[PDB]
Design a protein around this ligand. Structure first.
Ligand SMILES: NC(=O)c1ccc[n+]([C@@H]2O[C@H](COP(=O)([O-])OP(=O)(O)OC[C@H]3O[C@@H](n4cnc5c(N)ncnc54)[C@H](O)[C@@H]3O)[C@@H](O)[C@H]2O)c1
Ligand SMILES: NC(=O)c1ccc[n+]([C@@H]2O[C@H](COP(=O)([O-])OP(=O)(O)OC[C@H]3O[C@@H](n4cnc5c(N)ncnc54)[C@H](O)[C@@H]3O)[C@@H](O)[C@H]2O)c1
Ligand SMILES: O=c1ccn([C@@H]2O[C@H](COP(=O)(O)OP(=O)(O)O[C@@H]3O[C@@H](CO)[C@H](O)[C@@H](O)[C@H]3O)[C@@H](O)[C@H]2O)c(=O)[nH]1
Ligand SMILES: O=c1ccn([C@@H]2O[C@H](COP(=O)(O)OP(=O)(O)O[C@@H]3O[C@H](CO)[C@@H](O)[C@@H](O)[C@H]3O)[C@@H](O)[C@H]2O)c(=O)[nH]1
Lengths: 340, 339
């Protein structure tokens, strides 16, 4: 077994967690994935093994079930946890706020209690730029005022508050909270990537499905924003860069003997139209679109100040927009219908 | 059936819940109480029946157990809920945040899930002046900035947010959020009242127990506050007035066909030493005290602007500090064993 660590990755069958499980295994950690497959497929776990040549432990477990979760700790000498498990569809969160609060807050609360009981005190938490609400300006740094405009954002704000209070009660806690911006792309092998259920809510999967022929036409949400081409601007970050950030975060908790909160982004914003043009160039496929009305709740612009992460955890985004598009496209083309 | 309504009162064996169940029953509502008795006794339910001559249904259930809660809805024609169920020890909330978040958030979320399932969409929620954090001034009105200094307060802020979101999801929801200040006193029968376990964290039960002689002397937390006598100033409100505010709230939800958020306070603050002095007069007993160091987290001064409640729900506090002390004292004397 590993002398580096044994990492419980909740939500590890999903998009970012699968990529993270890959990087952990590649760096010699032991990995235990807990995922109830509410938004992911079992075959993603097989593909993590096809990539790494290593078999992480897998438990098909609702992590809000403390009894079920404690049986995972019975079976494995967990040294730290990365908590990816959550529902994450904003539109759905507005429609079903109770389930979002229940799933997202109870899964965290359950983990925290089992960890406390088992004296495991190292946790990395998936937060979001959604905690910055309507930003006054970009680039956004960590000391910006926190608010949210949708229940999904609220679950992330409330999670961060819970984590602070848990450490306030037991100062032995070491928490890395990582506020991701807009992850896109896929492992360079093409063997894993994002596999949305149904019609994608997010930009790059929609673009990719237009490119492969699964969808007919991209809709661009709003063309009158206060941005150079009137379309929304976001900080797209390669999911492999994001996954490496998690190894950096764990090392930083160790070295610093202290909690940290840091943005994970590139610092460069791209408009919707810039993304489409980049994807067409990288893919060689057409992405026809139409300019339609703003989607309610969207901000004009949002991108990170990556400075804190560079200083605190020694991490920077490496892969550019072209590479994000190229790698997302390889996954889509080679897996036209997603996993199996 | 009551023609008025069948009200699910979660946490209804507790202090404010029991008083509110009494006012509901007396005003012709049917009442179903769900309480896991984590901070109250079954005897309280017998007392409600004694006071009122009516028999509320009672279910000894953890309201965060959605399955157990659904069985309650199965059995009763619930028209609205008033959610008092929570853990409320501020000090314990700092030491035990996971337990507070789990209890206070899951109980509400389970309730809201079941209510949506059964299409019951009227709720009154027990919030607190704690949501105002450290106020910039008093009287405090409802539009003051919200913040909290402990996990207990965080659970109230989070609850208020969850409730706004439930209505954003389904705009037929009607939510009366009521921010209580400092409830004190007891039903005038003396048959129910505040029954803390162990030594009381809050002012008046400690003063009442000092006056009766169960505790030797009152400790006063700080004497160097920017107040007239240097001790903390608070908006004390008679729990019977408070309970009455819940009936007003239910009615206003119907009238305005709109959600509301109001303070329930008197608008008048009294200092720690002013409470002591008034209790002495109503009880005819002495209350010895020692001036000690400030209690961390304690605010110098906090009292409500009662204007919005008066206008929005037609309610005002009637009972004065003298009445609060006399009623609290009657409970204390007649029930040395508590419940
Ligand atoms: N993708 C993004 O744009 C983005 C941006 C910021 C933050 N995040 C956060 O990052 C994390 C991962 O996002 P993702 O894109 O990988 O989404 P994802 O849906 O692919 O991954 C989440 C995984 O969690 C699982 N899960 C959900 N609830 C669970 C529960 N109760 N028990 C066990 N498993 C559960 C799902 O089945 C899924 O596999 C989430 O916390 C999300 O909120 C995502
Ligand atoms: N100073 C105050 O007393 C004050 C001020 C502002 C707000 N509040 C709020 O008013 C409400 C009632 O307060 P109170 O003074 O009557 O306290 P209380 O402890 O007497 O009443 C709360 C009741 O809820 C019950 N309960 C707790 N969790 C439960 C669960 N999961 N399922 C079923 N029952 C549960 C307890 O057994 C108790 O009987 C609480 O929500 C409290 O936070 C109180
Ligand atoms: O079909 C689409 C999808 C998106 N967009 C636009 O593309 C940009 C990116 O949107 P999307 O990929 O949906 O991400 P965001 O809305 O920036 O952020 C989503 O929502 C945030 C909460 O508001 C979450 O925190 C993130 O994880 C992310 O998924 C926005 O300007 C959208 O208006 C389109 O024009 N058409
Ligand atoms: O033994 C005591 C108890 C209280 N006080 C003082 O009396 C005042 C009232 O205190 P207490 O009765 O504890 O109420 P608060 O602290 O104002 O607030 C209570 O407790 C929470 C904050 O601590 C609030 O959110 C409410 O729930 C309320 O019950 C404060 O100035 C205290 O410093 C004393 O001097 N000695």
């Amino acid at each position: 077994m590993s002398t580096k660590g044994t990492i419980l990755v909740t939500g590890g069958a999903g998009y970012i967690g699968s990529h993270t499980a890959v990087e952990l295994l590649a760096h010699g950690y032991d990995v235990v994935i807990a995922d109830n497959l509410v938004n992911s497929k079992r075959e993603a776990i097989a593909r993590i093994e096809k990539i790494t040549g290593k078999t992480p432990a897998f438990h098909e477990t609702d992590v809000s079930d403390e009894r079920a979760l404690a049986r995972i700790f019975d079976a494995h000498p967990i040294t730290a946890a990365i908590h990816f498990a959550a529902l994450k569809a904003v539109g759905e969160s507005v429609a079903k706020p109770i389930e979002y609060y229940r799933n997202n807050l109870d899964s965290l609360l359950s983990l925290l209690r089992v960890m406390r009981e088992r004296a495991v005190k190292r946790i990395v938490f998936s937060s979001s730029a959604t905690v910055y609400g309507v930003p006054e300006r970009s680039p956004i740094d960590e000391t910006f005022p926190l608010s949210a405009t949708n229940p999904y954002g609220q679950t992330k704000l409330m999670a961060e508050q819970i984590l602070r209070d848990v450490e306030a009660a037991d100062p032995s806690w070491r928490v890395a909270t990582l506020r991701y911006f807009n992850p896109v792309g896929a492992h360079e092998s093409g063997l894993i990537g994002e596999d949305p259920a149904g019609i994608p809510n997010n930009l790059m999967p929609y673009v990719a499905q237009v490119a492969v022929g699964k969808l007919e036409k991209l809709r661009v949400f709003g063309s009158d924003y206060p941005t150079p081409d009137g379309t929304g601007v976001r900080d797209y970050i390669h999911v492999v860069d994001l996954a490496r950030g998690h190894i950096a975060a764990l090392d930083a908790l160790e070295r610093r003997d202290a909690s940290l909160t840091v943005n994970l982004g590139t610092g460069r914003g791209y408009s919707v139209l810039e993304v489409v043009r980049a994807f067409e160039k990288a893919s060689g496929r057409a992405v026809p679109y139409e300019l339609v009305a703003r989607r309610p709740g969207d901000v004009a612009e949002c991108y990170a100040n990556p400075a804190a992460a560079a200083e605190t955890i020694g991490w920077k985004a490496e892969r550019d927009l072209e590479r994000m598009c190229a790698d997302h496209w390889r996954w889509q083309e080679n897996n036209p219908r997603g996993f199996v």
